[PDB]
């Protein structure tokens, strides 16, 4: 099992051998390094901690996340690696194969590999029940004073309360989503890009976590 971290550059299409159009998402997986290796002996579970995308080294009066802080720099230095913006663990990958400070490359993944891609979905802000929960609108005429309302929120004296998990208006998006059984169309070592068939969760410039499909 293999895992790489990347940013979602955007979507495009590629023409297949048969001339079939394949919609694809461009992912850049440059600057991936194994920052730490966790084992059952020490941490109680086996995983590799991988850092993606180098950030600037510590400076005295850094006011932003662009420059690494002292605590982060130390953790990266232990791996003999530059400070990283994003760090994520991969439990799927075997600990023995990877070594601390080892670069993880796009070439690990190959074309035709079935993969599961994880990312935070795009944020929609505060949303009503119709958009958020796919509920039906009320009549738009015939005396209607019900259009985009949530509907009844309960019964009457029995219960005399709203049950937990009642679908109501609230903030929508920003959730972690894993799309399963996507495929790698192409891997570009030169550009450090992996082409993934279909669309992956989240905004452009959003971190995507590509793993080998759990279901096989």
């Amino acid at each position: 099992t293999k895992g790489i971290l990347g940013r979602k550059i955007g979507m495009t299409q590629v023409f297949g051998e048969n001339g079939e159009l394949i919609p694809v998402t461009v992912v850049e997986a440059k600057e991936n390094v194994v920052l730490q290796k966790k084992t059952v002996e020490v941490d109680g579970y086996n995983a590799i901690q991988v850092g993606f995308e180098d950030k600037k080294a510590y400076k005295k009066d850094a006011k932003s996340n662009k420059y690494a802080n002292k605590p982060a720099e130390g953790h990266a230095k232990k791996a003999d690696a530059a400070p990283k913006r994003f760090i994520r663990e991969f439990r799927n990958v075997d600990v023995d194969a990877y070594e601390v400070g080892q670069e993880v490359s796009v070439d690990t993944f190959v074309a035709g590999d079935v993969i599961d891609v994880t990312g935070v979905s795009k944020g929609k802000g505060f949303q009503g029940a119709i958009k958020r929960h796919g509920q039906s609108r009320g009549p738009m005429s015939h005396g209607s004073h019900f259009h985009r309302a949530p509907g009844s929120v309960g019964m009457a004296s029995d219960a005399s309360r709203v049950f937990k998990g009642q679908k109501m208006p609230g903030r929508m998006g920003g959730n972690t989503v894993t799309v399963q059984n996507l495929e790698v169309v192409q891997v570009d070592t030169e550009n450090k890009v992996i082409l993934v068939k279909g669309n992956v969760p989240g905004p452009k410039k959003g971190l995507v976590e590509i793993r080998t499909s759990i279901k096989k």
Binding site: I9, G10, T12, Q13, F15, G19, V26, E28, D188, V193
Partner: protein, 114 residues
Amino acid sequence: TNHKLIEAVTKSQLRTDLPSFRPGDTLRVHVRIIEGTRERIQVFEGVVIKRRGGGVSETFTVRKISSGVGVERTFPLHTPKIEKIEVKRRGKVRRAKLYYLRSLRGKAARIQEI
């Protein structure tokens, strides 16, 4: 430009063989068609009503009247399915999209040649 990485990955897909055509030009498009085992080229001849997009995602639409019924075919410009494109006629138009032609029929639909 578009994102540099997206351009680089899809650059190979782009084809230089295709002729330069504008909307309002009659084209003859040779499309590779597979009927069962047999494969043959079928020609669709129609005015180019619309051209949209850029890069590998660029597409064009050609409109023909077949047996008294209007048919429009939208092709990916860089699709490998099209054997060749031939510009039969160059026509004068005042707009990029010739959606008005859909309503028009017979003499009204005629486009003046350049």
